[PDB]
Each structure stands twice: as structure tokens, then as C-alpha cells.
Amino acid sequence: SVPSQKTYQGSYGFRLGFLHSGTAKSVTCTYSPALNKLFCQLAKTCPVQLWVDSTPPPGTRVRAMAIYKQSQHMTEVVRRCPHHERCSDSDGLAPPQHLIRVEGNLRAEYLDDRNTFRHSVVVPCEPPEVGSDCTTIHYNYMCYSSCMGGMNRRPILTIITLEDSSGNLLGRDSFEVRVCACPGRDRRTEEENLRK
Numbered sequence: 001s002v003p004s005q006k007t008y009q010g011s012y013g014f015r016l017g018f019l020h021s022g023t024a025k026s027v028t029c030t031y032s033p034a035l036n037k038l039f040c041q042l043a044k045t046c047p048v049q050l051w052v053d054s055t056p057p058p059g060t061r062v063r064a065m066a067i068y069k070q071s072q073h074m075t076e077v078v079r080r081c082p083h084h085e086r087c088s089d090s091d092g093l094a095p096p097q098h099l100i101r102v103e104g105n106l107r108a109e110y111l112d113d114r115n116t117f118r119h120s121v122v123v124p125c126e127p128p129e130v131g132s133d134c135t136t137i138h139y140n141y142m143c144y145s146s147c148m149g150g151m152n153r154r155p156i157l158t159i160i161t162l163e164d165s166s167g168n169l170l171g172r173d174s175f176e177v178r179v180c181a182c183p184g185r186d187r188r189t190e191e192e193n194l195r196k
């Protein structure tokens, strides 16, 4: 079993957005449109914007889940490595095995799927504040892409789904993620590799 990664705007015109953070050595999170890939440091804030063309119903939620990008690994659950799942860095809500956390939202819920064993984190879909045109969720990634016994250098995607109150699909978007010590340098390197 493998979750779908097909982009689907749905009835509400759902899609993600990312800030323009640049590639300076000091950057902690930076998004490459050319690669559709987020580069971020371990456990640092990753702002992900949610955009819609029309307001979804009360009770709509937004779920995040990681899968391996390579087909030969897609059936393996993405989880924290044997070190990080034991490192006592709980925020009081996220299970220590979960790679993806939501920062600063007490209504976040963490799911261990009873059938697929996959992890996800889901929040209620809140309207933009007055003066804003979108809503932002702040994610944290709690292992490096290189962590041995976990991701082990394998690339991952994050799939963001807009869901109704029953969990039915309303919209879907996705992006690759690399969790690394120097996201600005790695984004520059990979964009150069793509250009060459």
C-alpha cells in the first residue's frame, strides 16, 4: 500500500505556497521551485502556506504525511531513526517516532494508522487572519535525511491533503524534502546539478 501523490486542487482550489528565503549559508529552511523540494535543518520551523480559491466547510482538516520518493522504498513507513526516536525531545503531543510535527498548534492530532502503520499529523483548517490571504502551518522535521537506520539518505516526499471531517479527500499537493545541515548550500548544489 502506497498513498497517492497526485496533485489535486479539488473544488476549493487547494494548493501550497512557500516563502522566498534564499540560499545564504545561514538559512534554516528554503524551498526550490525548480526542484519542488524543501531543504531544511533538523527540527527548525518550516512555514508552509495553504491557499484556496473558496472557503471549505467547517470541520475541514489538513494532513501531512511523509513517504519515500523512490518506488522500491515506497511501501516502507517513514519514521524517525533508532537514535532520534529515543532522544527525549517530546513536545508533549507528538509521538517520539513521528518524523513530521506541527509547531505551536494545540489542536494538532497525530495518527498511527491502524492498517498501514503510517504516521501523519492533522490540524483543523483555519481561515487567514484579517489582512492575510493565506494560512500558514509551521512544520518540523525531526530526523536528518542521512540518519542511519531511518531515512538513511533516501529522499522523501511530504504529501499535504485537504480532508473533510470524515477524512475524505478534498485536495492534495506534495513536495520533496531534504533535512540537512546546510540547506542553502544543498539547494544551490542540486539546482546547479539540474541546470547542468
Ligand SMILES: CCN(CC)c1nc2c(C(=O)O)c(O)c(I)c(-n3cccc3)c2s1
Residues within 6 Å of the ligand: 050, 051, 052, 054, 055, 056, 057, 058, 059, 060, 062, 124, 125, 126, 127, 128, 133, 134, 135
Ligand atoms: C473551515 C474554516 N474556514 C471558514 C472560517 C476556513 N476558511 C478559510 C479560508 C478563507 O475563508 O479564505 C482560507 O483562505 C484558507 I487558506 C483556509 N484554510 C486553512 C487551512 C487550509 C485552508 C480556510 S479554513
Ligand SMILES: [Zn+2]
Residues within 6 Å of the ligand: 080, 081, 082, 083, 084, 085, 142, 143, 144, 147, 148, 150
Ligand atoms: Zn534521526
